[PDB]
Amino acid sequence: MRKNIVAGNWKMNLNFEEGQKLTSEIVNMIRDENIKDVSVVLNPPYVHLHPVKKLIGNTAGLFLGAQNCSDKTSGAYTGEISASMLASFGSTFVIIGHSERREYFKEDSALLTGKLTQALENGLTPIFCCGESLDIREAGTHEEYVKQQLTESLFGLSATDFAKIVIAYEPIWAIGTGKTASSDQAQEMHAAIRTHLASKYGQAAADEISILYGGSCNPGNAKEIFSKPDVDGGLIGGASLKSRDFLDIIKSF
Amino acid sequence: MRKNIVAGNWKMNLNFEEGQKLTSEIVNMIRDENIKDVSVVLNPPYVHLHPVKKLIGNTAGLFLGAQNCSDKTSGAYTGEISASMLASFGSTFVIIGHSERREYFKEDSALLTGKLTQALENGLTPIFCCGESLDIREAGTHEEYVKQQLTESLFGLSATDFAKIVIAYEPIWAIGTGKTASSDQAQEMHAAIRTHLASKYGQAAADEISILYGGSCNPGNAKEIFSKPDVDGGLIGGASLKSRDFLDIIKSF
């Protein structure tokens, strides 16, 4: 039995006042609507975790994440944030390997495993992001490329550490390129992922992992995307910044 | 009117509870001893800014900083923190170009300029870091290497924007290498820096800039280093994490 998850990735958006307004609206609506079978995760910038954690309070099904963490435990890494820091501030999730960090900071598969180890070591549920860019699609090697990403970063994990992870598939090729990904293409990639993970850990273990769609996911298309059997929710982008749109997506299962 | 500055760079150290007790110790002793003629800056990790700002309160001469900021204003840069965010959470300083980011994240002079633009745009005092490694010392190019760093990142700045900057010199060649930098060697580099800043902006303006020593700086040698005419304080490493050592450095002018 997988969990349905909606993870809001604010990215580098919102100052203190704006983050408080957004959070308070989401918490109020989540506490009043008492959504039963969906885990919601707010992934604001580092600076927001402490006050956002406070607004969440003891809301059921609402969790605090984060957008990145160091592969190191602690030390002389000015500007970096460790997994132990995130946990201490109330984080229980952490996005690892987002396309935008692979791109601008050249996070390779080895580095992302180190991050995974730190997250798991510190009680964080990693949201491990994979996905192929447009060149990979144009080469027709998209399914091998994404399965290759998963093999190099995840197939070192124990059976018990694997059961702790969440996957997000980002159709990088379909974001700002003029190419579009259909809900069938998302289901196609998600199933390719689950079958690949089952090949190593067994079908029962693969059938418990939440694989979230990380492409363009909004109130308009959320129901159709979430309707797919191997899509277990979404890693939301710009709709994370609008409390109403975010709640609409949450209510789309 | 150069200000003497003691800026504490926690690097990637300390959880929520540790950063609060360290901060509550620094604040208590600054208030009780009535420190008057020193600017004290705490640069904790991003996650601590919000609670640390509260503890700082209206403590005179005690300010909140940060260890890095993005070169972009906002948007799809997952994991990154903007200068407006920092300003929003109480930061009035920010370290830019620290040696550990130049190394591990390959931050070049073209990127640091963007960070500088963002910092000043948002009312932050940038603590621009520079320094030369051991291989540069052995090459005999230490002074020109450091000057090139300053030229490449700082000389695009207006006269009014230059007046708002703080410099930190990191003797990377003398940090964990087995080599030692005397207080005269530090003075020599600080003097070389000031004269190089005066090449573009004039001696009067250069004589207004706080140039902080970023090498091994602690209660054992603070007074001798700070006594040097072109040393205006320190960018402190490990001693930042011990409230008594940090206060002893503050009282070493």
Coordinates of C-alpha atoms in Angstrom, one line a residue, chain A residues 1-248:
Chain A
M1 CA 0.0 0.0 0.0
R2 CA 1.7 3.1 -1.3
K3 CA 1.0 6.6 0.1
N4 CA -0.3 9.4 -2.0
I5 CA 1.9 12.4 -1.6
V6 CA 1.7 16.1 -2.7
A7 CA 5.1 17.7 -2.1
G8 CA 5.3 21.5 -2.6
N9 CA 8.6 22.7 -3.9
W10 CA 8.6 26.5 -3.5
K11 CA 12.1 26.6 -5.1
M12 CA 13.8 30.0 -4.5
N13 CA 10.6 32.0 -3.9
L14 CA 9.0 34.0 -1.1
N15 CA 10.3 36.2 1.7
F16 CA 9.4 35.8 5.3
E17 CA 6.0 37.6 5.2
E18 CA 4.9 35.9 2.0
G19 CA 5.9 32.4 3.2
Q20 CA 3.9 33.0 6.4
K21 CA 0.7 34.0 4.5
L22 CA 1.0 31.0 2.1
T23 CA 1.6 28.6 5.0
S24 CA -1.2 29.9 7.2
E25 CA -3.7 29.5 4.3
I26 CA -2.6 25.9 3.6
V27 CA -2.6 24.8 7.2
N28 CA -6.0 26.4 7.9
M29 CA -7.5 24.6 4.8
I30 CA -5.9 21.3 5.6
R31 CA -7.0 21.4 9.2
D32 CA -10.6 22.2 8.3
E33 CA -11.0 19.8 5.3
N34 CA -9.3 16.9 7.1
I35 CA -8.0 15.1 4.0
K36 CA -7.5 11.5 5.1
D37 CA -5.3 9.6 2.7
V38 CA -2.8 12.1 1.3
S39 CA 0.5 13.2 2.8
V40 CA 1.3 16.8 2.1
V41 CA 4.8 18.2 2.3
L42 CA 5.9 21.8 2.3
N43 CA 9.4 22.2 0.9
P44 CA 10.2 25.9 1.4
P45 CA 13.7 27.5 1.3
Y46 CA 16.0 26.7 4.2
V47 CA 15.3 30.1 5.9
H48 CA 11.6 29.3 6.1
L49 CA 11.7 25.9 7.9
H50 CA 11.6 27.2 11.4
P51 CA 8.5 29.5 11.1
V52 CA 6.8 27.2 8.7
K53 CA 7.3 24.4 11.1
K54 CA 5.6 26.5 13.8
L55 CA 2.5 27.2 11.6
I56 CA 2.1 23.5 10.7
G57 CA 2.1 22.7 14.4
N58 CA 0.4 19.4 15.1
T59 CA -1.6 19.3 11.9
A60 CA -2.3 15.7 10.7
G61 CA -0.8 14.6 7.4
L62 CA 1.1 17.9 6.9
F63 CA 4.9 17.6 6.9
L64 CA 7.9 19.8 6.6
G65 CA 10.6 19.0 4.0
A66 CA 13.5 20.8 2.4
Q67 CA 14.9 21.4 -1.0
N68 CA 18.5 20.0 -0.6
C69 CA 21.0 18.8 2.0
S70 CA 24.7 18.2 2.2
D71 CA 26.3 14.8 1.6
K72 CA 28.5 15.6 4.7
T73 CA 27.5 15.3 8.3
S74 CA 29.0 18.6 9.5
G75 CA 32.2 20.7 9.2
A76 CA 34.0 23.2 7.0
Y77 CA 31.4 23.6 4.3
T78 CA 30.4 27.2 4.5
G79 CA 26.9 27.9 3.0
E80 CA 25.8 24.2 3.2
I81 CA 23.0 22.7 5.3
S82 CA 23.3 19.2 6.9
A83 CA 20.5 16.6 7.2
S84 CA 20.9 16.7 11.0
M85 CA 20.2 20.5 10.9
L86 CA 17.0 19.8 8.8
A87 CA 15.7 17.2 11.2
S88 CA 16.5 19.5 14.2
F89 CA 14.3 22.2 12.6
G90 CA 11.3 19.8 12.1
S91 CA 12.1 18.5 8.6
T92 CA 11.0 14.9 7.9
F93 CA 11.4 15.0 4.1
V94 CA 14.2 16.3 1.9
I95 CA 14.3 16.8 -1.9
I96 CA 17.5 15.2 -3.3
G97 CA 18.8 15.5 -6.9
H98 CA 16.3 18.0 -8.3
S99 CA 16.9 18.7 -12.0
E100 CA 17.8 22.3 -11.2
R101 CA 20.6 21.2 -8.9
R102 CA 21.9 18.5 -11.2
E103 CA 22.0 21.3 -13.8
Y104 CA 23.4 24.4 -12.1
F105 CA 25.6 22.6 -9.4
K106 CA 26.5 19.4 -11.4
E107 CA 25.3 17.1 -8.6
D108 CA 26.4 13.6 -9.9
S109 CA 25.1 10.2 -8.9
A110 CA 27.8 9.7 -6.3
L111 CA 27.0 13.0 -4.6
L112 CA 23.3 12.2 -4.5
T113 CA 24.0 8.9 -2.7
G114 CA 26.0 10.7 0.0
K115 CA 23.0 13.0 0.4
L116 CA 20.7 10.0 0.6
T117 CA 22.9 8.5 3.3
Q118 CA 22.7 11.7 5.3
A119 CA 18.9 12.0 4.9
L120 CA 18.3 8.3 5.9
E121 CA 20.9 8.6 8.8
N122 CA 18.9 11.6 10.1
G123 CA 15.4 10.2 9.8
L124 CA 14.4 12.1 6.6
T125 CA 12.3 10.7 3.8
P126 CA 14.3 11.5 0.7
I127 CA 12.4 12.7 -2.4
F128 CA 14.9 11.4 -5.0
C129 CA 14.4 13.2 -8.3
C130 CA 15.3 11.6 -11.6
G131 CA 14.5 12.5 -15.2
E132 CA 15.9 12.9 -18.7
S133 CA 16.5 16.1 -20.7
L134 CA 15.5 16.7 -24.3
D135 CA 18.7 15.4 -25.8
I136 CA 18.1 12.0 -24.1
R137 CA 14.5 11.9 -25.6
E138 CA 15.8 12.9 -29.0
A139 CA 18.3 10.0 -28.7
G140 CA 15.4 7.6 -27.8
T141 CA 17.3 6.4 -24.7
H142 CA 15.0 7.9 -22.1
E143 CA 13.9 4.7 -20.3
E144 CA 17.5 3.4 -20.1
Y145 CA 18.8 6.8 -19.0
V146 CA 16.3 7.2 -16.1
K147 CA 16.7 3.6 -15.0
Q148 CA 20.5 4.2 -15.1
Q149 CA 20.0 7.2 -12.8
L150 CA 18.1 5.0 -10.4
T151 CA 20.6 2.1 -10.5
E152 CA 23.7 4.3 -9.8
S153 CA 22.1 6.2 -6.8
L154 CA 19.7 3.7 -5.3
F155 CA 20.8 0.1 -5.9
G156 CA 23.4 0.4 -3.1
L157 CA 20.7 0.7 -0.6
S158 CA 19.6 -2.1 1.8
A159 CA 16.1 -3.5 1.6
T160 CA 15.2 -1.5 4.7
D161 CA 16.8 1.7 3.4
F162 CA 15.1 1.4 0.0
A163 CA 11.7 1.1 1.7
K164 CA 12.3 4.6 3.2
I165 CA 12.6 6.5 -0.1
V166 CA 10.2 8.4 -2.4
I167 CA 10.9 9.0 -6.1
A168 CA 10.0 12.0 -8.2
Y169 CA 10.2 11.7 -12.0
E170 CA 10.9 15.0 -13.7
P171 CA 10.3 15.1 -17.5
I172 CA 13.0 17.7 -18.0
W173 CA 12.6 17.3 -21.7
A174 CA 9.0 18.5 -21.4
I175 CA 9.6 21.7 -19.3
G176 CA 10.1 24.9 -21.2
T177 CA 11.1 23.1 -24.4
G178 CA 8.0 23.3 -26.5
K179 CA 7.6 19.5 -26.1
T180 CA 4.8 18.3 -23.9
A181 CA 4.4 15.1 -21.8
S182 CA 1.0 13.4 -21.7
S183 CA -0.4 11.6 -18.7
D184 CA 0.1 8.4 -20.7
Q185 CA 3.8 9.3 -21.1
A186 CA 4.0 10.0 -17.4
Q187 CA 2.4 6.6 -16.6
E188 CA 4.8 5.0 -19.1
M189 CA 7.8 6.4 -17.3
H190 CA 6.5 5.7 -13.8
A191 CA 5.7 2.1 -14.7
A192 CA 9.2 1.8 -16.2
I193 CA 10.6 3.0 -12.9
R194 CA 8.5 0.7 -10.7
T195 CA 9.3 -2.4 -12.8
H196 CA 13.0 -1.5 -12.6
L197 CA 12.9 -1.1 -8.8
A198 CA 11.0 -4.4 -8.6
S199 CA 13.7 -6.2 -10.6
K200 CA 16.0 -5.6 -7.7
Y201 CA 13.9 -5.3 -4.5
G202 CA 10.9 -7.5 -5.5
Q203 CA 7.5 -6.4 -6.6
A204 CA 6.1 -6.1 -3.1
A205 CA 8.8 -3.6 -2.2
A206 CA 8.4 -1.7 -5.4
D207 CA 4.7 -1.6 -4.9
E208 CA 5.1 0.3 -1.6
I209 CA 7.3 3.1 -3.0
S210 CA 5.7 6.4 -3.8
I211 CA 6.7 7.6 -7.3
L212 CA 5.6 11.3 -7.8
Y213 CA 5.2 13.1 -11.1
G214 CA 7.5 16.1 -11.1
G215 CA 6.5 17.6 -14.5
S216 CA 4.0 20.4 -15.1
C217 CA 1.4 19.5 -12.5
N218 CA -1.4 22.0 -11.7
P219 CA -5.1 22.0 -10.8
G220 CA -6.0 21.6 -14.4
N221 CA -4.2 18.3 -15.0
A222 CA -3.7 16.9 -11.5
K223 CA -6.7 14.6 -11.5
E224 CA -5.7 13.0 -14.8
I225 CA -2.1 12.5 -13.8
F226 CA -2.9 11.2 -10.4
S227 CA -5.5 8.8 -11.9
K228 CA -2.6 6.8 -13.4
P229 CA -1.9 3.6 -11.4
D230 CA 1.8 4.1 -11.0
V231 CA 1.6 7.9 -10.3
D232 CA 1.4 8.4 -6.6
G233 CA 1.0 12.2 -6.5
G234 CA 3.3 15.0 -7.5
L235 CA 6.3 17.2 -6.8
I236 CA 4.6 20.5 -7.4
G237 CA 6.3 23.6 -8.7
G238 CA 4.7 27.1 -9.1
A239 CA 1.3 25.9 -7.9
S240 CA 3.0 25.4 -4.5
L241 CA 3.0 29.1 -4.0
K242 CA -0.8 29.5 -4.3
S243 CA -2.6 28.0 -1.3
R244 CA -5.8 27.5 -3.3
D245 CA -4.2 25.8 -6.3
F246 CA -2.1 23.7 -3.9
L247 CA -5.2 22.5 -2.1
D248 CA -6.9 21.8 -5.4

